[PDB]
Amino acid sequence: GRVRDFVAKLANNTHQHVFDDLRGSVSLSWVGDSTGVILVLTTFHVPQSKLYRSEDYGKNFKDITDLINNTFIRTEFGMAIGPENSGKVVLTAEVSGGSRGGRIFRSSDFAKNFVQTDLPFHPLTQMMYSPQNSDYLLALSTENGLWVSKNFGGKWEEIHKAVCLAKWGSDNTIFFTTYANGSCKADLGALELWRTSDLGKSFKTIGVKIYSFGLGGRFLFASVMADKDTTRRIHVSTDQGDTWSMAQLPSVGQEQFYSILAANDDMVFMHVDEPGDTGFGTIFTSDDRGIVYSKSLDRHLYTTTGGETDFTNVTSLRGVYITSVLSEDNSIQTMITFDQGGRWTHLRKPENSECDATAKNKNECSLHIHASYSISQKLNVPMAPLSEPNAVGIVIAHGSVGDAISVMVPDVYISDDGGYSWTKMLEGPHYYTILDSGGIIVAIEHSSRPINVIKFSTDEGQCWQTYTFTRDPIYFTGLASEPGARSMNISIWGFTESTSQWVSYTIDFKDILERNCEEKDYTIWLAHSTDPEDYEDGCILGYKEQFLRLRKSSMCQNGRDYVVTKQPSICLCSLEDFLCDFGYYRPENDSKCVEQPELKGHDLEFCLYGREEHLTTNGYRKIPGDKCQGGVNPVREVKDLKKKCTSNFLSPE
Numbered sequence: 236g237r238v239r240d241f242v243a244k245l246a247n248n249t250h251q252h253v254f255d256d257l258r259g260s261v262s263l264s265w266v267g268d269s270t271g272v273i274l275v276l277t278t279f280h281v282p283q284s285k286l287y288r289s290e291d292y293g294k295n296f297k298d299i300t301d302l303i304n305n306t307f308i309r310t311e312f313g314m315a316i317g318p319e320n321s322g323k324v325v326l327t328a329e330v331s332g333g334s335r336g337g338r339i340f341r342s343s344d345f346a347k348n349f350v351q352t353d354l355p356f357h358p359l360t361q362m363m364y365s366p367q368n369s370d371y372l373l374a375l376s377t378e379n380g381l382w383v384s385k386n387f388g389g390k391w392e393e394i395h396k397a398v399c400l401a402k403w404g405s406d407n408t409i410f411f412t413t414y415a416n417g418s419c420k421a422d423l424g425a426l427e428l429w430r431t432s433d434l435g436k437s438f439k440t441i442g443v444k445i446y447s448f449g450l451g452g453r454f455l456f457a458s459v460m461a462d463k464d465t466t467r468r469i470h471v472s473t474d475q476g477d478t479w480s481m482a483q484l485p486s487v488g489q490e491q492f493y494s495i496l497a498a499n500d501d502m503v504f505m506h507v508d509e510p511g512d513t514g515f516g517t518i519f520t521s522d523d524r525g526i527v528y529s530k531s532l533d534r535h536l537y538t539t540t541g542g543e544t545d546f547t548n549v550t551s552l553r554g555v556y557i558t559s560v561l562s563e564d565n566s567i568q569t570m571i572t573f574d575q576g577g578r579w580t581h582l583r584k585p586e587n588s589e590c591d592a593t594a595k596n597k598n599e600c601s602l603h604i605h606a607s608y609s610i611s612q613k614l615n616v617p618m619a620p621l622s623e624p625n626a627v628g629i630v631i632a633h634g635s636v637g638d639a640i641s642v643m644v645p646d647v648y649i650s651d652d653g654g655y656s657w658t659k660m661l662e663g664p665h666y667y668t669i670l671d672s673g674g675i676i677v678a679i680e681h682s683s684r685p686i687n688v689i690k691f692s693t694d695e696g697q698c699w700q701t702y703t704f705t706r707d708p709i710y711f712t713g714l715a716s717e718p719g720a721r722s723m724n725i726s727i728w729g730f731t732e733s734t735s736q737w738v739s740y741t742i743d744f745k746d747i748l749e750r751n752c753e754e755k756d757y758t759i760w761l762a763h764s765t766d767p768e769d770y771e772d773g774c775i776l777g778y779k780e781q782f783l784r785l786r787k788s789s790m791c792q793n794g795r796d797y798v799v800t801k802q803p804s805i806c807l808c809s810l811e812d813f814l815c816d817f818g819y820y821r822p823e824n825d826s827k828c829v830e831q832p833e834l835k836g837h838d839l840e841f842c843l844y845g846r847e848e849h850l851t852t853n854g855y856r857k858i859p860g861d862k863c864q865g866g867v868n869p870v871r872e873v874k875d876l877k878k879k880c881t882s883n884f885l886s887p888e
């Protein structure tokens with residue numbers, strides 16, 4: 236344990252609040268950053284709606300149900316909370332069966348005063364704030380009109396009809412799909428993709444034969460129907476639709492799907508579903524254009540039914556992602572990549588962990604991670620893997636140790652180096668959060684039955700101390716805490732036993748970490764270190780990062796203003812910083828990219844109908860987000876591969 240005098244500190248700081256009876260649908264929303272404002276919304280269906288508010292981080296709520304006029308709020312649309320600190324809150328309310336249109340309750344300041352506005356239409360969707368201006372909203376109506384508002388929902392105007400899907404781009408741009416006749420389901424693949432810069436003053440048709448579309452990073456993606464067929468394929472656009480490239484990705488049937496797994500201004504992770512009811516697909520990573528794709532992972536478990544994947548950005552160390560794959564035998568293994576998908580491997584098992592029945596060898600086994608897929612199978616998993624960018628290196632997850640994901644009741648495992656190494660944090664399932672950029676870690680035992688106790692650790696999970704926060708135990712469902720993992724306030728939620736009420740105990744760790752952190756506590760940490768002795772040690776994507784990192788031994792507060800300190804070393808370029816361009820491959824182990832003897836499959840499709848500027852390749856492209864400098868420069872004098880597809884074909888004219 237190692238902490239002296241904790242019960243004293245936490246006694247004062249434990250704050251209980253009580254709420255009304257089960258069972259009602261419960262919504263909790265944080266409003267703003269550095270505000271402490273929380274909205275709890277409760278709705279009841281029997282032959283109404285309650286709304287509370289707290290400015291103290293959840294220590295004391297007081298009941299503002301007065302401010303909505305006592306009317307009935309609909310949990311379908313929930314609470315549409317404005318971006319950043321704009322403080323916008325919008326609630327959609329239920330109206331009499333035959334009404335003009337719907338009604339919403341608008342707060343422009345952190346839910347202190349609400350104004351009720353009657354809409355000219357009926358909302359089919361939660362209203363969506365424009366990213367650049369929180370005063371801009373768009374909604375889809377039940378008649379499929381696209382409605383827009385410049386004034387934050389006071390006045391609306393219908394800027395197009397027959398709209399399937401509509402999204403805010405950057406700079407108040409709206410992208411939406413329309414349909415000619417029939418219904419969005421009927422005309423699917425026949426959809427038309429539009430853009431409007433001026434909020435409906437003027438439009439442009441950027442797409443046709445559209446199955447679907449989506450945004451990630453700088454890319455606009457659209458899947459387009461074959462003129463000849465039911466197959467579709469991805470086209471990509473960097474200009475917001477003005478020009479369109481066919482991706483080098485396989486086409487799919489109507490059985491299959493694309494999923495954008497992750498996107499950043501450098502690249503995307505694209506999941507392509509496998510033909511047949513596989514339950515798996517292939518992961519591709521793109522180049523910085525989104526045009527050129529590299530096969531990253533085989534048999535990536537993503538289910539056709541319910542849409543579960545285990546795919547996880549480990550957001551506490553750059554380059555690092557974990558995911559599940561379906562082996563040849565039907566068993567699920569976890570895989571981790573440290574280099575942004577350039578290579579996948581098995582997570583290393585804890586030093587002292589021993590293998591389970593899954594493992595065919597008893598001293599030699601991996602760690603496997605419970606994530607969305609596990610949870611969906613009703614395995615005993617209260618939480619998915621957790622990591623925060625402020626807390627460098629830290630990953631917390633339920634797992635098992637063996638050759639595959641085990642159905643047994645999992646322990647909880649922690650990593651401080653971003654997933655290179657692991658130890659058992661806690662035996663048994665737990666709920667966990669991170670406070671104060673890793674200054675504190677907090678855990679609740681997951682029990683079939685009531686708990687009066689919360690666990691906390693100030694050394695990043697190496698040591699734990701038990702605190703009893705209530706002497707009347709609760710049935711415990713969840714933790715609420717301020718997003719961004721910067722506060723010292725945690726809210727334990729649950730209900731009492733039997734004739735009941737929901738309760739929340741919010742604990743301030745304010746005095747548990749009494750003294751502030753200062754330079755002395757931090758220590759120099761090279762990320763991604765494999766071999767100390769090496770010049771190139773810790774180069775990922777062409778460079779190293781050295782971090783200043785809070786000493787495990789130091790017990791103190793990083794503070795709300797804490798800034799991860801790190802400095803880059805820029806590594807010399809090797810071939811391993813380059814990906815094969817179109818029509819090139821690595822045949823041997825050797826990194827070197829050589830010309831393919833000929834194009835096959837979707838390589839041949841791309842070559843046949845492909846956009847011509849990309850056809851000449853350098854054989855080599857710098858991995859996106861790779862910052863390496865100097866060293867090797869294999870990128871080549873451009874060479875036209877157009878003729879080498881068509882050299883086989885007889886040509887006309």
Ligand SMILES: *[C@@H]1O[C@H](CO)[C@@H](O[C@@H]2O[C@H](CO)[C@@H](O[C@@H]3O[C@H](CO)[C@@H](O)[C@H](O)[C@@H]3O)[C@H](O)[C@H]2NC(C)=O)[C@H](O)[C@H]1NC(C)=O
Pocket residue numbers: 497498499500502503504548549550551553624
């Ligand atoms: C996996 O998760 C990591 C950690 O969150 C992602 O890295 C983050 O990427 C975002 C977007 O590229 C970076 O955003 C920042 O946005 C501000 C403007 O709001 C801009 O001024 C900054 O220059 C920066 O772009 C964010 O800094 C970055 N976080 C860290 C710690 O590097 C990563 O993108 C995720 N991977 C994928 C493929 O999405």
Ligand SMILES: *[C@@H]1O[C@H](CO)[C@@H](O[C@@H]2O[C@H](CO)[C@@H](O)[C@H](O)[C@H]2NC(C)=O)[C@H](O)[C@H]1NC(C)=O
Pocket residue numbers: 271290291292294721722723724743795
């Ligand atoms: C934990 O919650 C308390 C509220 O109970 C937060 O206190 C606020 O602190 C800021 C700056 O320290 C003040 O400007 C606010 O006026 C305080 N509000 C109240 C109601 O006291 C405290 O910041 C939270 N702790 C952390 C680490 O975020």
Ligand SMILES: Cc1cccc(NC(=O)c2ccc(C(F)(F)F)cc2C(=O)O)n1
Pocket residue numbers: 446447448449450456457458467469491492493494495542
């Ligand atoms: C889990 C699941 C189930 C069913 C469908 C999907 N994905 C898509 O429909 C999709 C989304 C985005 C894009 C685009 F934006 F990349 F183009 C293309 C498609 C596509 O399949 O055609 N995902």
